[PDB]
Amino acid sequence: LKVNQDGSRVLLRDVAKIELGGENYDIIAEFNGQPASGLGIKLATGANAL
Q: Which residues bind another protein (CB under 8 A)?
A: 21, 24-26
User: C-beta of 21: minimal distance to another protein in Å?
Assistant: 8
**DSSP secondary-structure letter at 10?**
E
Q: What are phi and psi of 13, to 5 degrees?
A: -65, -20
User: C-beta of 15: minimal distance to another protein in Å?
Assistant: 19
CA separation for the pair 50, 48 (Å, rounded): 6
User: C-beta of 45: minimal distance to another protein in Å?
Assistant: 33
Q: Looking at beta carbons only, is 25 or 46 nearer to another protein?
A: 25
